[PDB]
């Protein structure tokens, strides 16, 4: 009980937790939770896009 240990978990629960975390992270910086638009994710995807673009150039160079 009480969720102790390392028991298995459902994909519905993974996104569930990840949503409560995003909402709380927003509360610490914007002090509100209405979230009409969610800038937290938009700013994160821009980093993931930059990292991915850098790796693509390496494959091009490696192939050359």
């Amino acid at each position: 009980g009480s969720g102790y240990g390392l028991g298995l978990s459902t994909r519905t629960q993974v996104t569930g937790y990840q949503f409560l975390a995003r909402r709380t992270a927003m509360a610490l910086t914007r002090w509100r939770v209405r979230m009409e638009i969610e800038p937290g994710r938009r700013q994160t995807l821009a980093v993931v896009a930059s990292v991915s673009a850098a790796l693509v150039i390496c494959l091009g160079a490696l192939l050359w």
Binding site: R30, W31, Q43, A46, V47, S50, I57, C58, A61, L62
Partner: protein, 100 residues
């Protein structure tokens, strides 16, 4: 800086952005000394912060169209997208792989 509402937390972000510009400008005068550099640096170093004081006092009392507000948002993303591809170039990683 827009995403932080607390007073000192937001000031430290804006302050970090301005000090980089000022520090890089001065570095270009105390080395590579010449009339252009010392003149240009003296101009940027005084005009750049002045432009901010005007925008800081003027923006809060005006109304802007949603097409423009939606555009400044996209300036941030266009600033992040080039960092990694440029850093790996400065580090010389691509040449090291192409001439493996």
């Amino acid at each position: 800086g827009r995403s932080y509402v607390d007073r000192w937390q937001s000031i430290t972000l804006a302050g970090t952005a301005v000090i980089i510009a000022a520090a890089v400008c001065v570095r270009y005068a105390l080395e590579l000394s010449s009339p252009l550099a010392v003149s240009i640096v003296a101009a940027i170093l005084v005009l750049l912060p002045a432009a901010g004081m005007a925008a800081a006092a003027h923006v809060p009392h005006t109304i802007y169209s949603p097409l423009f507000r939606k555009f400044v948002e996209w300036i941030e993303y266009l600033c992040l997208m080039p960092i990694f591809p440029l850093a790996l170039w400065l580090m010389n990683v691509y040449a090291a792989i192409r001439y493996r």
